[PDB]
Design a protein around this ligand. Structure first.
Ligand code: ZN
Lengths: 176, 131, 141, 38, 136, 94
RNA sequence: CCAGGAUGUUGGCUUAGAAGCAGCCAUCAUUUAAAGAAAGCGUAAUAGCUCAGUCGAGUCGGCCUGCGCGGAAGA
């Protein structure tokens, strides 16, 4: 509702194509094409994109609010781009990237080879740190979650893949 | 929470009555400052530790409006802090000027010396006035 | 005047120069030495009088020693040799216990020249008279 | 998590969210406050 | 528990609980727990309900019990043929009509009132509502 | 002080009284002085909030019926068996 | 959301030590737009978290009531 009341601005070069309920945001980096719900009514005017409900639906604004943030991130991805840094804490935990595949050695008796989706590239400035980059915030967040499941840091030392913006709390090992 | 109507009428009514007798009222930006600095600025102006107070552009707008004053809205943009003088020569502009020790001036948006409006390029003129 | 940067405060009195049983290695485990608490500490402490629990900031950077500036001690340490008894309250409020007064703690909390807010010798003066009565003591002001 | 017909907001960080049709209690300060079947 | 220290009779018929209640207003304290549903309160339910509120208030204020069992209940054990005389009294209950001021409290804040009766109402079989002393 | 709009009833009996409680209304009666009793039907909600104040049972009331302000006073009130509602209130001309 | 969230004072007694955050009490004052001698976690005592000017119009939650929800697992 309120969020939908805040029109989103699109930088220069950001080509926006609307086809009924489809939104194609192609800019400097990558191109995203998301399909809105059906109760949302996007209006391309001037150099911004407004959002509003549609007569005949209950939630109405409940959908316009999301579509406001959705296309919003779509523009941010095709302009500045999103990034997620996941560092590997622990002994023997290393990381390597050979092309579009990421090899991880989380103590496993066999190096894991995660496969990157559509447009998701990442390197490693350190043997224990990965930097994911993409144009889709939803995707870059899922890929970071996959590598986050391979080894969830325990509340004792935090050993395992974590997030650069995540705080892991630890605890003692009980007495006796 | 919030402040009841009757409780807000007084707040603005007070800041207005003190503005009618204030010989001066300089406005400036005080963001990123600490308490130790604020106190130091208060100790410099008056040993009573009371000087330089932060107020909203609204509380000041309707306060400067409740009193015959004009052309000051430009001095009320975003973070605003007022510094008036109800007694003694309003030449205490040198104190704050030297306190900010800034080679610029922008911070000290404007002021009103003796009912006379003054821009930001005049904050130094008064801060360099001889005894 | 800036931000957080080490500044503990644990002492028992001004007499005990760098004690051990009370605290000891507790006053220096991050950047303070459990020995130099007599050089820079008693740098002027023995030049006045040792008998009032006086705390102090730490302030440590990375230059070995520290530049801690001692200041005015608690206003309670004046409630054992400046207000009256040193202890023994018997019963909390079931009895008025003891009792201070106006003249008492008057020129005792005035010596403070490195603390207190507001120079108004009437608002910052009575500010050191609340606790003196908060312990069940009566007010003879 | 502790599942039981009754579900409430223990701490102030509690939140009563409905998923698929089941009341749940999400927490971000105490994993013990995690509930289900409300 | 609460039960008549003496009764002119040991047993009593069924006795239906019809009509409304009498004690609807508080005439002893400033607050109190009022009944809404229909049923009967046993000596255990009443006693247990008292401990709850009495405990939620530490040892301050005062509580009153407008209700009282004063009604014996007979029941026959297992492996017993029907008849052979009326059963034996096992416990005493109290008929509670919609609007019966169950308990009352005074000497404590209004907030602590609801909380107290809240932990006591959960002990009661029937529903209840919080009421406050009214003038006239 | 407390103005309470009223309207003379057209039928008495528990039957009519009940039909009133099923429309946010309740029966009433104003007796006292040399005047004869008068059936009155006050609004539930309205009076439901007016009685919430202790000044409603202390200070004098002013009922306006058929263009007439009769200064009365709360004599007695009958509350709902268990719900926070009203059944009937007696007023006295004073 | 980005903010601030201070000071007397580590309040007095108790204690190995308790400083808002064992526990007895007490609960005034202060500079203010506002900050409780202090909500929860956390410390051996501290520390560290943290709750109670901008943006620009809607927000907060008890009560009466309708319709629903979970509560609801058998061969
Ligand atoms: Zn929780």
């Amino acid at each position: 509702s309120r969020v939908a009341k805040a029109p989103v601005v699109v930088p220069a070069g950001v080509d926006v194509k609307i086809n009924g309920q489809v939104i194609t945001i192609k800019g400097k980096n990558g191109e995203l094409t998301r399909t809105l719900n059906d109760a949302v009514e996007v209006k391309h005017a001037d150099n911004t994109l407004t959002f509003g409900p549609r007569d005949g639906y209950a939630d109405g604004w409940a959908q316009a609010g999301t579509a406001r943030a959705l296309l919003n991130s779509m523009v941010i991805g095709v302009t500045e781009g999103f990034t997620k840094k996941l560092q590997l804490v622990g002994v023997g935990y290393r990381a390597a990237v050979k092309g579009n595949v990421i090899n991880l050695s989380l103590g496993f008796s066999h190096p894991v080879d995660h496969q990157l989706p559509a447009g998701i590239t990442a390197e490693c400035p350190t043997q224990t740190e990965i930097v994911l980059k993409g144009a889709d915030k939803q995707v870059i967040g899922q890929v970071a979650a996959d590598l986050r499941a391979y080894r969830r840091p325990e509340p004792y030392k935090g050993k395992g893949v974590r997030y650069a913006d995540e705080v892991v709390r630890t605890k003692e090992a009980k007495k006796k | 929470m919030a402040l009841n109507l009757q409780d807000k009428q007084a707040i603005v009514a007070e800041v207005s009555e003190v503005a009618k007798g204030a010989l001066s009222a300089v406005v400036a930006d005080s963001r990123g400052v600490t308490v130790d600095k604020m106190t130091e600025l208060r100790k410099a102006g008056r040993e009573a530790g009371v000087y330089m107070r932060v107020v909203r552009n609204t509380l000041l707008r309707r306060a400067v409006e409740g009193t015959p004053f004009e052309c000051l809205k430009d001095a009320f943009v975003g973070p605003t802090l007022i510094a008036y003088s109800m007694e003694h020569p309003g030449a205490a502009a040198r104190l704050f000027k030297e306190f900010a020790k800034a080679n610029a001036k922008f911070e000290v948006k404007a002021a009103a010396f003796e009912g006379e409006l003054i821009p930001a390029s005049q904050i130094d003129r008064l801060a360099t006035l001889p005894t | 005047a800036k931000k957080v940067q080490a500044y503990v405060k644990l002492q028992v009195a001004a007499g005990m120069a760098n004690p051990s049983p009370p605290v000891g290695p507790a006053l220096g485990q991050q950047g303070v030495n459990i020995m130099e608490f007599c050089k820079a500490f008693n740098a002027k402490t023995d030049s006045i009088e040792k008998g009032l629990p006086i705390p102090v900031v730490i302030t440590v950077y990375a230059d070995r020693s520290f530049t801690f500036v001692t200041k005015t001690p608690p206003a309670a340490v004046l409630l054992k040799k400046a207000a009256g008894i040193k202890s023994g309250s018997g019963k909390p409020n079931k009895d008025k216990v003891g009792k201070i007064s106006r003249a008492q703690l008057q020129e005792i909390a005035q010596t403070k020249a490195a603390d207190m807010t507001g120079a108004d010798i009437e608002a910052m003066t009575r500010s050191i008279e609340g606790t003196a009565r908060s312990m069940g003591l009566v007010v003879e002001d | 998590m502790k599942v039981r017909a009754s579900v409430k907001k223990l701490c102030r960080n509690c939140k009563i969210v409905k998923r698929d049709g089941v009341i749940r209690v999400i927490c971000s300060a105490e994993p013990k406050h995690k509930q289900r079947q409300g | 528990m609460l039960q008549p220290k003496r009764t002119k009779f040991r047993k009593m018929h069924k006795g239906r609980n019809r009509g409304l209640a009498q004690g609807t207003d508080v005439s002893f304290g400033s607050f109190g727990l009022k009944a809404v549903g229909r049923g009967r309160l046993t000596a255990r339910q009443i006693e247990a309900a008292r401990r709850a509120m009495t405990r939620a208030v530490k040892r301050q204020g005062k509580i009153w019990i407008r209700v009282f069992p004063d009604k014996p209940i007979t029941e026959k054990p297992l492996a017993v043929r029907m008849g052979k005389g009326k059963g034996n009294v096992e416990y005493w209950v109290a008929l509670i009509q919609p609007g019966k001021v169950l308990y009352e409290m005074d000497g404590v804040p209004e907030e602590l009132a609801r909380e107290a009766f809240k932990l006591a109402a959960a002990k009661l079989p029937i529903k209840t509502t919080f009421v406050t002393k009214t003038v006239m | 002080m407390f103005t309470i709009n009223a309207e003379v009833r057209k039928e008495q009996g528990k039957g009519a009284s009940r039909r009133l409680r099923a429309a946010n209304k309740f029966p009433a009666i104003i007796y006292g002085g040399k005047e004869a009793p008068l059936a009155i039907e006050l609004d539930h909600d309205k009076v439901m909030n007016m009685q919430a104040k202790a000044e409603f049972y202390s200070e004098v009331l002013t009922i306006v019926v058929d263009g007439k302000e009769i200064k009365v006073k709360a004599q007695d009130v009958q509350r709902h068996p268990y719900k926070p509602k009203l059944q009937h209130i007696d007023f006295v001309r004073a």
